[PDB]
Symmetry: C3
Subunit: 326 residues, 3 copies
């Protein structure tokens, strides 16, 4: 029985980080306790001041990544302060029954509720508010013994990074400029019309064109293995590490399945999270992007990863530098 | 030789049902005989009276699902009554040679023809009229010994359901309202222009926004295993069972391949059929949908499954009901 | 060490052909030397004279396919004559570090450079100019022992064919006709606006609506096994052999992974190359196409394969020819 089990309380962190956690664990089924605070707000989403009338779990797009193990129970306290304007809920793709929890978690402003479900299937899993993919994140459910390659050999990551990718549908006034709305409710009707064209005005990693560039680049060092968790609650995307690979990729994001190796580009189905391991072998700046290069370069779906360490001439070498043609 | 074999005659049924059939079978290679009647007609496809100038196999979108076993031969009598206006044919993705049969089956109004081909590859397979994905269905070819999991362990379904998903491209007049055409031939030119924008006006399960909702919901009981066969002859879709999973999914729909487990969302390539098993564990209403939530909610790609049985507190429990914040 | 190894010089050929090469090889790690000449030019891309302001490796879309083995080193001399107008580079998805080589290969008109990298991961891999998917091709890296099926059984192809698929975004003037630009630089601004709609004006195999039809059809004979290499540096496509199958398909295009069998339609992620084997069993004309039939028929993503040999009545037979209804 679940009630008769130990309870742990987890402190969540902002994306792109994932809270500290154990991979392989001698430990036993726990009930893991999480709390999240829904937050409506306006956000600047590009370099030119365009705003989005947003809804978030915990203030961030994406919401934070919750981590448990196969067999653990997730118990989430979902809070929706009075400072907000709408009901909300949460649908956990990792959970079974009641529209993934959506039905047991409808909370008006100033309300709260608490859900428990068995996390009995390993993998990365999207949770989102039932009709809003803008409010989403990843539930990572690790197998009790850690990640395994197709032959059962152990696998691991030294650091985890979390990337939620968002297709945005921002309306334009008669002048051709993006509309700014005073409330969430007023954005609604125009946004739907733009959504019906199926053409995003913007596709952003982590809230904003550039969220994962400049001072905000991800980081690693040569010899380090990194887990890239990629979620997209609404639209297909195709992650690619420029100059890298996915050493082992669960593109459908479910750990009881063997991963694929050596991927150049993988595929995240809209309504899901997937996961890729890469061990760095060269230093420098990498681009992690959506390999529709229009969606990446023109619309916003690209980030960087600054990698420290020693250059390897065996893997790659500049034989003749750029020079005039003989 | 095929001629020297026993012949069976199968009675087809309307979607979402699949005609009664054997899974694992001690039986031997049969020649299975099917007949289909092509039918052009106008259809109401949404809640507001929008019509589509349609073509169907057997009166329904999708056409009925034909079921055989690996090694069986499909022999189809394709009929096109005089009451119709165009030639038609059938391309079976399950068949080898002659454009999947398209070349041996061109039938003008008042004509008919009969095709046989070896069904020598297991899987769910799309058949459609050569230039019209609107006229399509699934050929399920079962392995002679039934469905197998990745380790060879036997698998099964207690009931099969069939979902054909259709991207529709309905033209608008200068006033902004959907055009109504008196014939199939007059819809053609405007529809092509809208098709060239690659933006469906509608994406429907089984003919109509709502075909699989209300009184028409699919049905199951807790402890039952259901096969969800999903076909899309023209455009990519991404099925998801809200509150459920795909326990075992052949997303490319070919049974000699190991299935994947625990999928939250799977992917059907345009021009194919895939297949998912789910064993229910909770009662209530589920939504089976295209997890581009614009395509589902705004455009029409969503259905329901009403599930009877006993609630399970272990899997999911409401710990604190929605209540004011302390 | 790489410098201490034998060097081979390979002569490249125009698509759809792939230069002669060994599959399984008793031979040892070589350093393979390739040279490519970048070429800007205007091209006619459809039947009605529409032009594209193009950039190519070696004069062709796609660029030629480079073939090596796992363990070999690729050393490419990249040349950009003075007759051109822009810098260019190359990003090899098969390579590790320095943005796949892009950083070590920026070459202005009249410059050249030479890159070496270890090809240490088997598979088909896209190489392209960093911001232009129009300039792309495939690096096929074969496993040293040849293609293997999921059980380790040997596989082979008798001939290889190469298909690069290109989504084109051609601007229209106020009259509704495609714009013709005098330089590459003048096409830029209008093209970007059209790209931002994410709606190709054209999707072409190998440079041109029809490049792989009529006298230019691919060819085979019954009993022959063919490798279809399919690359798409920018957008998702879904190859399908009408009347055929993918006997063994590495849709993510990476050979250390087991292939899937019996596929009706496969999926190439934008930013990747995949690969399918088919052994012909029937003669006639086949269509190899993108199974979004709008993208194929209306936009240009379809080709033919003329197959010689003996008709097989076991696989497929016309039982009753088209005839009046009794
Ligand atoms: Zn909400
Ligand atoms: Zn490590
Ligand atoms: Zn969902
Ligand atoms: Zn037809
Ligand atoms: Zn059962
Ligand atoms: Zn087809
Ligand atoms: Zn370039
Ligand atoms: Zn051969
Ligand atoms: Zn690339």
């Amino acid at each position: 029985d679940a009630d008769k089990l130990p309870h742990t309380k987890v402190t969540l962190v902002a994306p792109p980080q994932v809270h500290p956690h154990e991979q392989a664990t001698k430990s036993g089924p726990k009930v893991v306790e999480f709390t999240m605070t829904i937050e409506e707000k306006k956000m600047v989403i590009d370099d030119k001041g365009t705003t989005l009338q947003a809804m978030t779990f915990n203030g961030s797009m994406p919401g934070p990544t919750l981590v448990v193990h196969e067999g653990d129970y997730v118990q989430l306290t979902l809070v929706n302060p009075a400072t907000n304007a709408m009901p909300h809920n949460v649908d956990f793709h990792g959970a079974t029954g009641a529209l993934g929890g959506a039905k047991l978690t409808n909370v008006n402003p100033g309300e709260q509720a608490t859900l428990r479900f068995k996390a009995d299937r390993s993998g990365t899993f999207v949770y989102h508010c039932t009709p809003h993919p803008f409010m989403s994140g990843t539930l990572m459910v690790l197998p009790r013994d850690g990640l395994k390659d197709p032959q059962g050999k152990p696998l691991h990551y030294d650091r985890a990074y979390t990337i939620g990718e968002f297709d945005l549908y921002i309306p334009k006034g008669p002048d051709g400029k993006y509309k700014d709305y005073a409330t969430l409710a007023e954005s609604y009707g125009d946004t739907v019309q733009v959504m019906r064209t199926l053409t995003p005005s913007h596709i952003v990693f982590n809230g904003k064109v550039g969220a994962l560039t400049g001072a905000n680049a991800l980081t690693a060092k040569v010899g380090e293995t990194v887990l890239l968790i990629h979620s997209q609650a609404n639209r297909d995307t195709r992650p690619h590490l420029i100059g890298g690979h996915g050493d082992w990729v669960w593109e459908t994001g479910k750990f009881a399945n063997p991963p694929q190796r050596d991927l150049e580009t993988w595929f995240i189905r809209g309504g899901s999270a997937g996961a890729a391991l890469y061990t760095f072998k060269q230093p420098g700046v990498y681009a992690y992007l959506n390999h529709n290069l229009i969606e990446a370069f023109e619309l916003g779906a690209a980030g960087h990863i600054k990698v420290e360490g020693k250059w390897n001439d065996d893997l790659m070498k500049q034989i003749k530098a750029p020079a005039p043609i003989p």
